[PDB]
Amino acid sequence: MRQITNLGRNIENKSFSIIDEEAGPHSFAQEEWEVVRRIIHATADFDYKNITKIHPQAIDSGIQALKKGCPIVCDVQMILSGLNPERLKVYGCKTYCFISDEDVIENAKRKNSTRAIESIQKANSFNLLNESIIVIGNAPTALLEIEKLIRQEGIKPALIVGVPVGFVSAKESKESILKLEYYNVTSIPYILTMGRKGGSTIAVAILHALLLLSSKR
């Protein structure tokens, strides 16, 4: 479930209350607001109240795949190191991150690409991008490879959590997921933070919020 003192639980509920009060009126649904607020909570940055975008199917589609014990593929290790394994076992979700794998780094140097792009391709070769939750919280090149695989092959992940932070392709990487949404009738559900802002913590924030939402039947 989760290990946190009753005090910590009080400090947290005390924060969410302040965050709600401060943010002011917003345009999210109850279920959605919880994810947005959770990001604000993880960063003390209120911009995620505006830059955060939640595909209409994002919550259901994601919580559903979570219960099926679907896999969770992250681009950077930190994201994994932030999830309570105990909470994940309940559903039986397997996690992945080939960013530091031997072959990935070998192909990346050879192909003159990035590790993130190559680990996304590795997860793809094992059919891991299928009906799963892909969390990109650091490498835009990763989120772009997904953009590509979606058009090229049909990869149909359960949910894309594209919140990479960057100054070069971060902005675009997220905009492109929105372009896929425009052209397709039934597009891949997503939760992304538009612009350059994002990061492992933002992603973890989202996962925890989603899990807690699932927990609440």
β 95-96/52-54 pair status: unpaired
Contact partner, 26, from a copy of itself, Cl ion, none, Cβ < 5-8 Å per class: Cl ion
**CB under 8 A: which stretch of 60-68, 87-95, 178-186, 196-204 binds a copy of itself?**
196-204
Alpha carbon of residue 200 to chain centroid: 9
Q: Any idea what DSSP says for residue 29?
A: -
Query: How far apart, in whole angstroms, are the C-alpha atoms of residue 190 and residue 199?
Result: 16
**CB under 8 A: which stretch of 29-37, 58-66, 126-134, 197-205 binds a copy of itself?**
197-205
Residues 137-156 that bind a copy of itself (CB under 8 A): 141
110 is in an annotated binding site: no
74 contacts a copy of itself (rule: CB under 8 A):
no
113 contacts a copy of itself (rule: CB under 8 A):
yes
Q: How many residues bind a copy of itself (CB under 8 A)?
A: 45
| DSSP E strand boundaries for 25-158 | 52-54, 72-74, 95-96, 133-136
Reported as half-sphere exposure (CB side, CA atoms, 13 A), residue 213 has a value of 25
Cα–Cα distances (Å) from 39 to 3, 152, 157, 183, in that order, read 20, 32, 23, 29
The Cα angle at residue 66 between residues 10 and 182, in degrees rounded to 5: 105
Contact partner, 109, from a copy of itself, Cl ion, none, Cβ < 5-8 Å per class: a copy of itself
Pick from 141, 187, 193, 214 the residue near Cl ion by CB under 5 A: 141
Residues 14-43 that bind a copy of itself (CB under 8 A): 14-15, 18-19, 41-43
Active site residues: 41
Residues of this chain that interact with a copy of itself (CB under 8 A) are 3-8, 11, 14-15, 18-19, 41-45, 77-78, 80-82, 100, 105, 108-109, 112-116, 141, 165-170, 195-201, 204
